[PDB]
Amino acid sequence: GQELSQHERYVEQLKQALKTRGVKVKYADLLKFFDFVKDICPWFPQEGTIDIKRWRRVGDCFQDYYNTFGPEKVPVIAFSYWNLIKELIDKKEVNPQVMAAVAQTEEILKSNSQTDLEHHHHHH
Ligand SMILES: *C(=O)CCCCCCCCCCCCC
Questions:
Q1: CA-48 nearest atom, ligand 1
Q2: Ligand 1, pocket residues at CB < 6 Å
Q3: Which domain of life is it from?
Q4: Minimal CB count within 10 Å: which of 22, 58, 64, 86?
């Protein structure tokens, strides 16, 4: 959600990198969103976090299939992919939804094995 603002600035950074590849001028957010959103999130485009283990499984499936299918528009962007996914998470260490899925799913407030409410304790 709000993290969207962060995605904007980044989107601009990703475009610059590809720009140095001598590649034409295309949108990264869209090209990636549509492709990925439908890739790891084919039935749930609501969130869809960045994943290396999954994107890899679904990545090879569609990819290994598209290529083995002898395509007529064999894009080079392929080679670029995968490698970018790794270096991506790194520069993402900033504070994306990935880090949130942790603070949210595993709130620090959680007791030893109870809940954040903590019946034993009473604060107000
Ligand atoms: C809430 O709607 C914000 C979206 C939550 C997940 C997105 C977080 C960052 C997305 C990474 C994009 C870069 C690689 C595709």
A1: 6
A2: 1, 3-4, 7, 32, 36, 47, 49-50, 88, 96-97
A3: Viruses
A4: 22
